[model samples]
Target: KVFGRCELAAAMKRHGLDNYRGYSLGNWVCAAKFESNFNTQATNRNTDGSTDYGILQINSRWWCNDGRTPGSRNLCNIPCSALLSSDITASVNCAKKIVSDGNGMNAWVAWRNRCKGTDVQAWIRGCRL
Candidate 1:
């Protein structure tokens, strides 16, 4: 699902993740921009041989199962496809749990590589949310 910046912000806010885990809404937006460009069905194959799922680019290694993939821990206990939807509730919830695992948004390589120490406000520049 394709989403404009404001649309994603509103969904994130509705899911109570605008300021979740002490991360700003801009941070989330920025991360999503670099991770999947706000495409809900986005997926990527990492160099480590694992697949990233959905908007936040969650990994199958530890978060969800992509039935064809081997060695998933299924920590979230949900199917990987569940994260690939316009309805972001499941993705946001899984992200919160991932952050709660003590690394914060650092769990996402995109966040560390792109959003970290960057001017994230540009992500929500015209959103006004």
Candidate 2:
């Protein structure tokens, strides 16, 4: 499921991400753009031999179980495929869990490298939320 920026922003706001875990909605929006371009089914094979899943690109190595990956802590206690659904409920919930676990947005490399210090307002532009 590929979502437009405005659509994704609306969903994030609905999910209470305006100020979730001290992070702004723009932060998450920017991260999502860089991570998966709002594509729910996005997956990437990391150089570390793990897969990143969903919009936030949650890692299979420690976050969710993909079965193909070894040594997962299953912190989210969900199958990686669950994050790939058009409905983003599971993905958002798991993202909240990941942020609460101390990594914050640092858990996503794209956030650190792309979203940090950038003009995040653009990510939410034209979204009348």
Candidate 3:
């Protein structure tokens, strides 16, 4: 599972996608706790022999071109590295591109939710430094 707040923050930072590194470790952990239990190697099988992978549970096909097949351009090519490595961010950034139009997490509703309707700046007030 995701375990604690610091772990989640570390993951986000390692991804290089985190805009405010100085913000919201607890809330980020809460999201992971709610989403997928923070299992970095977690995978769910598809009937087609494909699998989902990593802590955030990003799908194989979606991220790595050869992710569906072991030893391709996916995790197999890189072996066991941190879940938040550049490879993972490549996928996360791809997703972010479609959603945020290159603004990163600025478009994430989940990040907004943690803001508690206060000022926008206040939303990230709880983040770490």
Best by TM-score: 2
The C-alpha RMSD of each candidate to the native structure, in angstroms, is 1.2, 1.0, 6.8
Tell me model 2's lDDT, rounded to 2 decimals: 0.89
TM-score of each: 0.93, 0.95, 0.44
**Best prediction by lDDT:** 2
The weakest ten consecutive residues by lDDT in model 2 span 66-75
Q: Compared with the true structure, what per-residue lDDT tens digits does model 3 show for residues 31-58?
A: 3443356655555665656554554444
Best to worst by TM-score, what's the order? Answer: 2, 1, 3
Deviating ranges (above 4 Å) for candidate 2: none
Write model 1 residue lDDT over 9-77, tens digit each, in one string.
878888888779889898998888899989999989977678899999999889998876676699998
Clashes of each: 0, 0, 5
lDDT of each residue in 5-35, candidate 2, tens digit only: 9999999999888889898889999999999
